Ligand binder design. Sequence first.
Ligand SMILES: Nc1ncnc2c1ncn2[C@H]1C[C@H](O)[C@@H](COP(=O)(O)OP(=O)(O)OP(=O)(O)O)O1
Ligand SMILES: [Ca+2]
Ligand SMILES: [K+]
Length: 430
Amino acid sequence: GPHMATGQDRVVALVDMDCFFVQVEQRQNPHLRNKPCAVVQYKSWKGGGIIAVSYEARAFGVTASMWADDAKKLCPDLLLAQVRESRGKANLTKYREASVEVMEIMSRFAVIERASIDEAYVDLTSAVQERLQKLQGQPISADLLPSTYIEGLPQGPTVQKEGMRKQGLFQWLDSLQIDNLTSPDLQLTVGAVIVEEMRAAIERETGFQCSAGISHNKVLAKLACGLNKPNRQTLVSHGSVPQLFSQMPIRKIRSLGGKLGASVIEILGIEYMGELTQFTESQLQSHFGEKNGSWLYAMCRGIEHDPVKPRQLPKTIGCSKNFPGKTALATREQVQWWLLQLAQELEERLTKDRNDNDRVATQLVVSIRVQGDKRLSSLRRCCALTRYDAHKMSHDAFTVIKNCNTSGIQTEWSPPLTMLFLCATKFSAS
DNA sequence: ATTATGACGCT
DNA sequence: AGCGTCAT
Ligand SMILES: Nc1ncnc2c1ncn2[C@H]1C[C@H](O)[C@@H](COP(=O)(O)OP(=O)(O)OP(=O)(O)O)O1
Ligand SMILES: [Ca+2]
Ligand SMILES: [K+]
């Protein structure tokens, strides 16, 4: 009762750019705007691999992880933009720089955690408190929430999509004004007002649209964000959780989309997140470990405590290339040439990072895959990164992996290498 | 023959 | 440390 924590202490948002690499290419090339289009890397094998898809193209069934030749079967008029190639490899700089544009705007509003190239969590608790003081008990108008969905509403005693959105928003605001909701509900609502403002600023200042979720923690904000995409935001209140979770497949919750989630389903014989509430904390810990068990026990009740970390910059800077099928690296000089290409891109990015962000990487991680290996990485070795110099880094990388070569002929490399990976890590202030 | 990333957990 | 999981 009175001592039962409800995980309603924070306001957290997750902002997720819509079709991000496609928007970056559409801003650059107006011919691609409002068209079925996709971003592809490379072109020779089956037309290239699709890595991002506009919503117009998704209507035809085009997805990422599709070959462009196959996407064209579904959507013959699909437009394509190619990822830049430099030094023999795909180069993602344009998208990393577009990411910085958005992250810097978000940072004006609040502390953010960079979750990926186009996702950031936002801790809005303090901003909401501030806005509430400005507001002075003045009610919140629907006009302040023009792209907001309230999950679970409308309900109870119009067949258009926007009409439904407004009906739900009206019910929510009507209740807030009549004092039939909770202080956490008001906090979330003010959070959503701020996120409208944030999303408007992103679009104004970059041209890019995004979706967002607002809730009391990162997992619910992420779940919320996906409910209404694209170009919309969704508020998931604490009270919405029992209905929302009652039919929510376990794999939809972040961290449960893989083997752990499959084990939860199999071991417990359940399908939906809400079904977890019937187990004790000890029962869950007994199957999934102390940490996972406690996390699951709280999470299925809508409670999570993972903080929004104050981190706007990536912690690592890496460069990798696959060498599939017949293109696997089978000679010494091949391996060395590609290590150099990778090291040259890495040096370029590191030098920029050092100038921009007042830090230096101190460790170089070298990873390879060998042909036949089940896993993405076969071997990982570290060495010191003491100089931002591509020839040195590439020579050092060779040294730490050269003994993986089974070949008696040192000119040859066996078994052939199907992946090379260089990663700069362990930053120190500079 | 998805590819190129990136954070965090385990022992 | 080196490996594995989960995610954009
Ligand atoms: N598996 C991947 N391989 C390479 N690039 C990827 C991969 N997944 C995502 N990306 C890139 C391209 C995406 O535009 C960008 C952001 O990813 P993501 O949020 O999953 O999709 P998206 O922004 O294209 O569409 P959505 O509107 O559904 O969010 O990161
Ligand atoms: Ca996205
Ligand atoms: K994303």
